[PDB]
Amino acid sequence: QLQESGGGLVQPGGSLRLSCAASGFTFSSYDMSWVRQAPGKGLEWVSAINRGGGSTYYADSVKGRFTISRDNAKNTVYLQMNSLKPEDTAVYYCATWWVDSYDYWGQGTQVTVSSHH
Amino acid sequence: QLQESGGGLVQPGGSLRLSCAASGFTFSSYDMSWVRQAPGKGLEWVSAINRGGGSTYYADSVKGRFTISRDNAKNTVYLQMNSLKPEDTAVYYCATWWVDSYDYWGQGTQVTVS
Amino acid sequence: DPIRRGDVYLADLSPVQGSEQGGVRPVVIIQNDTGNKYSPTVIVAAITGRINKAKIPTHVEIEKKKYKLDKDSVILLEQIRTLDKKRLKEKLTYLSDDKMKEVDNALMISLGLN
Amino acid sequence: DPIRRGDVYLADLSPVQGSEQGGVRPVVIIQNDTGNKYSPTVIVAAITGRINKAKIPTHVEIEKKKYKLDKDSVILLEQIRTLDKKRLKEKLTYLSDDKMKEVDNALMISLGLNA
Ligand SMILES: [Cl-]
């Protein structure tokens, strides 16, 4: 019902474009959030966007580096991540935000930022 | 229906309190204004005050010299005029302001500063 | 009548459906004064006396004495409807300036206007 | 399923007296989203198709094509009433953020509110 894509491995300072595709429910009725989880270290909420797209929100840790967006015709959410650093390595989930709680959850996509080897 | 009182002759720098007494209609439903007319001149708006009293307004010519007030229990409007000057000499009418227009008019009262 | 914002009138809300506040009860005029002058309808907020104090940001308490009602009551800013003026019966009172500021912020929250 | 501020629903406003808008017609949810989630009632503004243009600051035009209406219509921000959600029929559409900004301003005028 919610499928993430776009994750990957990047060097520090790189960028990626995560996307989340919705089906089985009316996408035009939920706000959307991105939340990430690094190994062991708890869940960190990342971003959000209202139902119509006009209003967007971001955690202090990603603020200004990431840009959230929505296409309600494609029933899709995007997260543009720039100036990535190792501390950004985590699994990234899309979720639906409705007033206070979450309802539907995606399966996640992995993001790793390291120089490798 | 609206009876003015309190006018008179005073020297410059003196003070007066004009009053306007309402009857025959529900006073707690209109905003009130003071407007004046000098001999051979047109009507000059002076001041105003909303239905509940919280909000007051004044013409630039009287601003800071005059203070408008209302007593809704006595169904009366007052104008305290201080630091009077010759240019304030005129007849002073109370009137009721309702959204945009005036409706009832009182019987003028004379104020002379000399 | 002249109908002013923040007046409290007796109004017939019947009939209603489900959880809407119905019956003949007091309501406060929340529509702008211009609407209250020319329009065949007004916009009101229901007042209920079946409760006394209320810990909700869309509720505003009103004393029975100062505002001359049957008992200490609560203005419900989530129960709003446009009534043709023919539904307004007798006039009870009007709200003070401070109370109407409270009604304004309560409306801002109720409608999510900030 | 959820009810969001700015949604347009078909709603039964009858009965009414005098000049109040009535019948079963589209309405816009103007209540805050918390109410729209937990409250048994919503607050709405009526939509009418009897005029497609309106010279009044409490009126907001809406085109038929974008919003899937039968014809170009007008949102009346001077006709607002709280309805039990049981009155809400089918969901027609929702307003854009821009249109909801206009609705908000019209509501600010209707109720004599200031930012
Ligand atoms: Cl009808």
Please tell me the distance from the alpha carbon of residue C71 to that of residue C63, in angstroms, as a whole number.
7
Chain B neighbors (3+ CB pairs < 8 Å)? C
Give me ligand 1 centre to Cα D88, in Å. Answer: 16
Which residues fall within 8 angstroms of residue B17, CB to CB, at 6 or more apart? B6, B78, B79, B80, B81
What is the Cα–Cα distance from A66 to C68, expressed in whole angstroms?
58
**Are the Cβ atoms of B52 and C34 closer than 8 angstroms?**
no
Burial class (CB in 10 A: 0-12, 13-18, 19+), D80: buried
Contact D94 A26 (CB under 8 A): no
Query: d(Cα A101, Cα A93) in Å, to the nearest integer?
Result: 15
Q: Under CATH, what is the fold of the domain C2-114?
A: SH3 type barrels. (2.30.30)
What does the alpha-carbon distance between residue C19 and residue C49 come to, in Å, rounded to a whole number?
A: 16
Per the CB < 8 A criterion, the answer to whether B31 and B96 are in contact is yes
Report domain extents, chain D: 2-115
C-alpha separations of D76 from C59, C78, D62 in Å: 25, 19, 11
C and B interact (at least 3 Cβ pairs within 8 A)? yes
Candidates B26, B29, B52; nearest CB to C96: B52
CATH architecture of residue range(s) D2-115: Roll (2.30)
CB of A77 closer than 8 Å to CB of A93: no
Cis preceding-peptide flag for D26 (omega within 30 of 0): no
- Give the C-alpha separation, A31 to A103, whole Å: 10
Alpha-carbon span B62 to C103, nearest angstrom: 34
Q: Identify the closest residue of chain B to C93 by CA–CA distance.
A: B28
* Nearest C-alpha neighbor of B12 from the set B92, B83, B62, B110: B83
As a whole number of angstroms, the distance between CA A14 and CA A36 comes to 18
| Segment holding A21, helix H or strand E | strand A16-22
For residue A63, give every residue at least 6 positions away whose Cβ sits within 8 Å of its Cβ, in sequence order, or none. none
Domain B2-105 has CATH 2.60.40.10: yes
DSSP SS3 for A87: helix
B23/B27 Cα distance (integer angstroms)? 8
Select the residue of C30, C84, C111 nearest D19 (Cβ to Cβ). C84
Closest CA to B58 of B42, B45, B39, B40: B45
Q: Which two tokens stand for residue D33?
A: 């989203």
Paired with C66 in beta bridges are: none
Tokens of D55: 């010279």
What 3 state SS string does chain D have?
A: CCCCCCEEEEEECCCCCCCCCCCEEEEEECCCHHHHHHCCEEEEEEEECCCCCCCCCCEEEECHHHHCCCCCEEEEEEEEEEEEHHHEEEEEEECCHHHHHHHHHHHHHHCCCCC
Contacts of C31 in chain D (CB under 8 A): 78, 110-112
Residue in B7, B24, B36, B29 with CA at minimum distance from that of residue B97: B29
User: What does the CA dihedral D13, D17, D21, D25 come to, rounded to 10 degrees?
Assistant: 30
Closest in C15, C86, C111 to D43, CB measured: C111
Q: Which long-range contacts (CB under 8 A, 24 or more apart) does B1-6 make?
A: B1/B25, B1/B104, B1/B106, B2/B94, B2/B95, B2/B96, B2/B104, B2/B105, B2/B106, B2/B107, B3/B106, B3/B107, B4/B92, B4/B93, B4/B94, B4/B106, B4/B107, B4/B108, B4/B109, B5/B109, B6/B109
Contacts of A14 (CB under 8 A, 6+ apart): A84, A113
- DSSP annotation of C35: H
Answer whether D37 touches A (CB < 8 Å).
yes
Identify the residue among B26, B27, B29, B104 best suited for mutation to test binding to C, counting C beta carbons within 10 A and taking the highest.
B29
- Judged by a CB distance cut-off of 8 A, whether residue C32 touches chain B is no
Q: What is the DSSP letter of A28?
A: G
Side-chain half-sphere CA neighbours of D56 within 13 A? 18
- Measured in whole angstroms, the distance separating CA A112 from the mean position of its chain's CA atoms is 14
| Residue C54 contacts D where some CB pair is shorter than 8 Å | no
Q: Looking at CA atoms only, how far is residue B40 from chain C in angstroms?
A: 34
Distance between CA C55 and CA D101 in Å, rounded? 30
Which H or E element spans position C29? strand C24-29
- The residue among C57, C33, C61 whose CA lies nearest residue C49 is C61
C-beta atoms of D2 and A28 within 8 A = no
The residue of chain D with its CA nearest to that of A100 is: D34
Mind giving me the DSSP string for chain B?
-EEEE--EEE-TT--EEEEEEE-SS-GGG-EEEEEEE-TTS-EEEEEEE-SSSS-EEE-TTTBTTEEEEEETTTTEEEEEE-S--GGG-EEEEEEEEETTEEEEE-B-EEEEE-
Written as six digits, the tokens of A111 are: 């993001």
**Distance between CA D46 and CA C57 in Å, rounded?**
25
At C105 the three-state DSSP class reads helix
Whole-number Å distance between alpha carbons of A89 and A87: 5
Which 3 state secondary structure label does DSSP give C40?
coil
CB-nearest partner of C32 from D80, D104, D112? D112
Name A117's Cβ contacts closer than 8 Å, sequence gap at least 6: none
Which residues 60-79 in chain A show a CB within 8 A of chain D?
none
Pairing relationship of beta strands D7-12 and D88-94 according to DSSP bridges: antiparallel
Task: Judge whether D75 is closer than 8 Å to chain C, CB to CB.
Answer: no
User: Among C8, C19, C21, which residue's Cα sits nearest to residue C70?
Assistant: C8
A15 to chain D, any CB pair closer than 8 A? The answer is no
Q: Which residue, C98, C90, C71, C84, is CA-closest to C44?
A: C84
Distance from C-alpha of B65 to C-alpha of B6, rounded to nearest angstrom: 17
Tell me how many residue pairs between chain C and chain D have CB atoms under 8 A apart: 100
Q: Which two tokens stand for residue A42?
A: 């708890």
Nearest of C84, C103, C105, C102 to residue C28 by alpha carbon:
C103
DSSP state of A63: B
Those residues whose C-beta lies under 8 Å from the C-beta of residue B31, and which sit 6 or more positions away, are B48, B49, B50, B51, B96, B97, B98
Write down the domain spans for chain B: 2-105
B42 in reach of chain C (CB within 8 A): no
Please tell me the experimental approach by which this structure was elucidated: X-ray
- Tell me if A53 and D1 make a contact (CB, 8 A cut-off): no
Task: Give the residue carrying structure tokens 């000499």.
Answer: B89
Q: Which chain D residue has its CA at the smallest distance from A99's CA?
A: D34
Contact B96, B68 (CB under 8 A): no
